[PDB]
Design a protein around this ligand. Structure first.
Ligand SMILES: Nc1nc2[nH]cnc2c(=O)[nH]1
Ligand SMILES: Nc1nc2[nH]cnc2c(=O)[nH]1
Ligand SMILES: [Zn+2]
Ligand SMILES: [Zn+2]
Lengths: 358, 358
């Protein structure tokens, strides 16, 4: 099994479909990664996460380092073992969640619940992460200083990873592009990332509230800046329509808490758009969540029952909603993969859109 | 398939083991019924409830009648259909939960979140319950008046059930014995119940705080009062040791929220007694919840992980704890069944006890 081998099987415009082969499994691209925050994809057994078609999950470095602790997890045999998921895991570096969730310096970030690039890579090493993210940071003058520090930290991240042989031979390292919405800075960052060399390139700084029109505009010049021959990862995105539009602009990988979080809150994704299952209109609706969905929830239970469950605050409500929503997301990615491979993605996106917003 | 056929395959002292055959399935006795409060066994899919070995679950008439409503559930195809459990369901009558959970009369009980024997049977009819409980009520003088009203209500329950042909031919009706801790009243009640005739006889009024020594003393004279040839159901009991002692005194059926509720709260049952998984002693314990347990949780996850889950308030923590605890309970009942069939129950109970309290 290769450490990390990205092969593009087909293209359509800027869209790509293909595979990443890793020691613990194959990742089909474009890929959606369910987020497994505290060593769990909320309300799902890992076998269920797999059943939905996920090839890889996301774990959080910030959260695990506090609870239960990275050295504790290593002692316990590593994150794969601990949570019972034996496939690839991508771990975020902690960067984003240290700012928005809790004393900054060139050395790193100090905080309250001393993370640096080196320590970040070490914690991810300890968790036994398959895809390690470089440690990074959150106006033009300011965008460049944040972006410039991150590129320094990416070089630090690179060397720390390379210094750990066990990591170098079995894991992969991704660079994160910053630069806010400025093409010039974005360019700078890709140039610096490319000169360091990484297995994959993320687009950071766009899961921020900017809106889709502006996110797409930034992806429009940003992704062509990245090495074509490596996977392109859009962090923290997104809604089904965000995903389709991002793939149309060259993104191969995605993660988002939307399908899980939303599910627990009553929101179910369908090919005709999201529904809120708690609405009284579903109280006697015997139809499944979505009438095309292949997941186990839609084979077995009605909207009416899941309506009842969620209104009553029952745990099974969250389990069912979450399984469906992750399944939906995986089915979307499969439809994306098949349509690019068949040279009909552009039509798929148009048809998708017409029905989903309708 | 018979409507209701109880066959005793073997006996040891007052203990019995055997089967109840019903249209929707066979019930192995002594049986433990997971409680499925609001049309769900909390944090478990019904396929999982089945996997643990449960043959029958308990649903609550009081709760369902308020949410989502019995006529609504009937319109939706019935409780089996609605929650996706296709095996027997016993529904409690609402009696117990109307008192302790929220204007009394010979007619019935009026309350705030007009239930009578007739309405109770009608609601259970609407839910499509396989085992219907008769409608009943919560000092000697007073015990007899409560007990005496209940026996009147049991006669009303009998006729209401018999008046519904669809119910009479496909469901079963159980009588509930009351009388508090007095042998004389207990006797009275069995005599009245027996004279009406029921498919099964419950012992009500002992899930009350009286303590095990006193509960066992009451079961000591109470169960021999009931028709030998019908199943004997102890409502709302109990801990593993309560169950063993009750079987030793003639009880064939049990329900309790203990394994589910306790599981969500961090308490796991083991053959060496209950543990509280949240205790710091388990933080790095790689052993399963119980080192003999055959359930799927104990095959896959460590105490340490489930410790982490429950401390973090994660939904998967509740799912895993609950699956294990219900599995444990079913394994206990299987051990009980096998030991009576083999004529070594008395020794089983002694060995069980030595280890569990140890
Ligand atoms: N590390 C990191 N994580 C993210 N998640 C969403 N956006 C980002 C980002 O820019 N950096
Ligand atoms: N209906 C009813 N339910 C119970 N659950 C526990 N005890 C009782 C009882 O005495 N009657
Ligand atoms: Zn579905
Ligand atoms: Zn177990």
């Amino acid at each position: 099994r290769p450490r990390f081998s990205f092969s593009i099987a087909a293209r359509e415009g800027k869209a790509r479909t293909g595979t990443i082969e890793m020691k613990r499994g194959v990742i089909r691209t474009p890929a959606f990664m369910p987020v497994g925050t505290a060593a769990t994809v909320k309300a799902l057994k890992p076998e269920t996460v797999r059943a939905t078609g996920a090839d890889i999950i996301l774990g959080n470095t910030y959260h695990l380092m506090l609870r239960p602790g990275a050295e504790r997890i290593a002692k316990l045999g590593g994150l794969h073992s601990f949570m019972g998921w034996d496939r690839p895991i991508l771990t975020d570096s902690g960067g984003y969640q240290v700012m928005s969730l809790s004393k900054q310096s060139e050395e790193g970030v100090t905080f309250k619940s001393m993370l640096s690039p080196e320590r970040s890579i070490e914690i991810q090493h300890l968790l036994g992460s398959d895809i390690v993210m470089a440690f990074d940071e959150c106006t033009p003058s300011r965008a460049a200083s944040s972006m410039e520090r991150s590129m320094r930290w990416a070089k630090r991240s690179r060397d720390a990873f390379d210094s750990r042989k066990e990591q170098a031979e079995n894991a992969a390292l991704f660079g994160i592009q910053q630069g806010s919405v400025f093409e010039n800075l974005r360019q700078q960052s890709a140039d610096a990332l490319a000169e360091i060399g990484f297995d994959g390139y993320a687009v950071g700084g766009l899961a921020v509230g900017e809106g889709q029109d502006e996110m797409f505009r930034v992806l429009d010049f940003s992704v062509p800046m990245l090495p074509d021959d490596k996977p392109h990862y859009l962090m923290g995105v997104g809604k089904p329509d965000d995903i389709v539009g991002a793939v149309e602009r060259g993104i191969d990988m995605f993660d988002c808490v939307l399908p899980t979080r939303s599910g627990r809150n009553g929101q179910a994704f369908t090919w005709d758009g999201p529904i809120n299952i708690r609405n009284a209109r579903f109280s006697e609706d015997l139809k499944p969540l979505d009438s095309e969905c292949h997941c186990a929830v839609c084979q077995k239970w009605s909207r009416a029952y899941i309506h009842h469950l969620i209104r009553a605050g029952e745990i099974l409500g969250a389990m069912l909603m979450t399984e469906h929503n992750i399944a939906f997301y995986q089915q979307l990615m499969q439809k994306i993969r098949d349509s690019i491979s068949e040279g009909r993605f552009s039509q798929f996106a148009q048809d998708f859109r017409a029905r989903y917003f309708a």
